[PDB]
Amino acid sequence: LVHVASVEKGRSYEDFQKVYNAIALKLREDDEYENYIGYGPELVRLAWHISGTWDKHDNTGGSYGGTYRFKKEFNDPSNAGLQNGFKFLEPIHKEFPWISSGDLFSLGGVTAVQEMQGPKIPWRCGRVDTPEDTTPDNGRLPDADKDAGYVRTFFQRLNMNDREVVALMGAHALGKTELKNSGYEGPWGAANNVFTNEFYLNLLNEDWKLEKNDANNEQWDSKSGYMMLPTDYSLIQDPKYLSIVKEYANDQDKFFKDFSKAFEKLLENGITFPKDAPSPFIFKTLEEQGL
Numbered sequence: 001l002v003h004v005a006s007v008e009k010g011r012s013y014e015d016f017q018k019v020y021n022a023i024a025l026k027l028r029e030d031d032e033y034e035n036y037i038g039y040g041p042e043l044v045r046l047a048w049h050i051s052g053t054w055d056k057h058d059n060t061g062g063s064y065g066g067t068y069r070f071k072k073e074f075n076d077p078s079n080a081g082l083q084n085g086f087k088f089l090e091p092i093h094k095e096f097p098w099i100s101s102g103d104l105f106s107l108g109g110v111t112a113v114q115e116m117q118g119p120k121i122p123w124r125c126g127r128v129d130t131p132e133d134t135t136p137d138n139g140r141l142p143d144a145d146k147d148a149g150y151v152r153t154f155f156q157r158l159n160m161n162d163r164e165v166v167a168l169m170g171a172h173a174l175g176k177t178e179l180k181n182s183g184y185e186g187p188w189g190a191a192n193n194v195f196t197n198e199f200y201l202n203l204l205n206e207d208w209k210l211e212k213n214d215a216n217n218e219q220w221d222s223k224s225g226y227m228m229l230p231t232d233y234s235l236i237q238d239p240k241y242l243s244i245v246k247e248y249a250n251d252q253d254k255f256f257k258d259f260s261k262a263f264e265k266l267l268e269n270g271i272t273f274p275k276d277a278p279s280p281f282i283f284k285t286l287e288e289q290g291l
């Protein structure tokens with residue numbers, strides 16, 4: 001199956017910068033969310049869960065179709081804790097009804113990452129909403145109680161290699177886990193509304209202890225009150241992953257370039273851009289607009 005990007009009828013880079021700006025301004029407006037974490041981390045996770053449904057073997061799932069708008073997918077157990085980010089975006093869709101759902105969910109994550117002082121992430125429009133019957137069944141998103149072999153194997157389905165995996169997992173500098181969503185509890189670090197390489201430094205520098213939690217799942221805890229999922233921990237248990245973790249912990253510039261590429265790829269897997277499709281767009285932050 002082939003999904004060909006189709007640019008929203010007469011839209012252009014400034015139309016999409018407007019939508020960016022709208023999401024960015026609402027991030028500021030609602031920055032009290034989750035005792036001032038803000039909605040940024042939730043939007044990044046949202047954009048990853050909408051994209052993470054892709055199966056490269058038959059091109060099912062993926063961001064192009066905007067299928068998260070159907071109750072089968074937004075009620076996926078794996079998507080618990082994303083309902084507020086979804087509701088966040090709803091009025092903005094109402095403000096810009098010409099944009100497709102997948103373009104909107106994808107753009108939410110690009111916007112969040114940039115506004116949280118992360119790398120610029122080029123973005124491309126043209127995802128086209130696809131009907132209810134194309135929604136992917138539940139179960140395509142990764143489990144957290146697993147090891148490096150699982151992770152490596154899992155991400156192969158998303159066409160991601162070891163560097164891309166380690167780079168993408170770096171978004172766990174953002175936000176936190178909550179028992180009520182995922183059965184895990186705590187943040188990975190202190191500055192969890194800022195996009196930095198802190199995840200890698202914490203993995204490497206903190207003393208970690210396997211402990212069982214209130215949901216009877218096991219997770220790795222530090223006395224500073226940080227935590228690592230077993231799949232996060234697997235990144236230093238595996239020699240090849242460990243090497244790249246060290247690389248990003250030592251060079252945030254390198255992490256930013258690698259993350260930007262991997263995240264764009266993640267968001268665009270499944271999509272065929274025609275020969276005369278427009279080039280990727282890089283959005284200015286509010287800051288760069290003096291807004």
Ligand code: HEM
Nearest residue numbers: 041042045081142143144168171174175176177178181182
């Ligand atoms: C083996 C792959 C993955 C696993 C098992 C995993 C697991 C989880 C867990 C269970 C949490 C907590 C959710 C909660 O309780 O609300 C979560 C949070 C988060 N994850 Fe992942 N994740 C992985 C990959 C990714 C990737 C690739 C990214 C981004 C490129 C992503 C970004 C996020 C974000 C930003 C949050 C915080 C959301 C919040 O605070 O609102 N994760 N992850």
Ligand SMILES: [Co+2]
Nearest residue numbers: 042081176178
């Ligand atoms: Co949350």
